[PDB]
Paper text:
For further structural understanding of the interaction of the DARPins with their target domains, we solved the X-ray crystal structure of both DARPins in complex with their respective target domains.
Titration of the SAM domain of p73 (aa 489–550 of TAp73α) with DARPin B9 yielded a KD of 58.8 nM, while titration with the SAM domain of p63 did not show binding, confirming specificity for p73. We also solved a high-resolution crystal structure of DARPin B9 in complex with the p73 SAM domain, which showed a 1:1 stoichiometry, as is also indicated by the ITC measurements. The selectivity relative to the p63 SAM domain is mediated by hydrophobic contacts to a variety of non-conserved residues throughout the SAM domain, including P491, G499, P503, Y537 and T540. In the case of DARPin B9 the affinity was increased from 309 nM (which is within this multi-domain construct significantly higher than the KD measured for the isolated SAM domain) to 64 nM for the leucine zipper construct DARPin B9 LZ and to 46 nM for the linear fusion construct B9-B9. A similar effect was observed for the B9-SPOP fusion.
Numbering used by the authors:
A (entry chain A): 4 to 64
B (entry chain B): 3 to 100, 102 to 159
Write the structure that this text describes.
Amino acid sequence: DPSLVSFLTGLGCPNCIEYFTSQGLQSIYHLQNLTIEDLGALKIPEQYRMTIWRGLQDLKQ
Amino acid sequence: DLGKKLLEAARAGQDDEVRILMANGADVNALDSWGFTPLHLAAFFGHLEIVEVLLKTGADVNAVDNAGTTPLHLAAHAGHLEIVEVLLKAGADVNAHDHGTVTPLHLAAHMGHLEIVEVLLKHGADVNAQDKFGKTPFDLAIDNGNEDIAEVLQKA
């Protein structure tokens, strides 16, 4: 889904997209409720992990 | 409403409905909840005839979504060479960058799109552009073992 491509582009880690799509997570909706623990389980390098997590929290209300 | 149905038609490749909905009063630059325009969606999903119809009808070639991504970003990522060429001819910003400071060339490099990498280079794409994590198009072509692109990116 372009929302996931665009999200990761906006954050600076387009190279992180395969960590999500390899688990069949295709859209920003599919990420919205992942935990810090979940992002580690996906084997996202710590370089990028918390940047992605904060980005997901910024989308919530 | 008209704008939502136009975004849906552009995504889905429904070229008649795209033409009809705009004539009926859909804004060519209607937004979805991510800030995508119909042009963003047509560019990502490879619908060249729809890209052309939207540009003719006044689509903003450099529209940014809520994360600062342009149609050229999406077409380059998705490997749609004919769309990338049509957007560049229509004045797409070759080095558009967002917070992440990621350019279309970064995405073409990462996804292994050789011909798009070359076309972007020919329109003055910045080989020196670093993302927020200091990675250049070159860095992402290496990290992904895209050898031909990494090569062409040194070549400039």
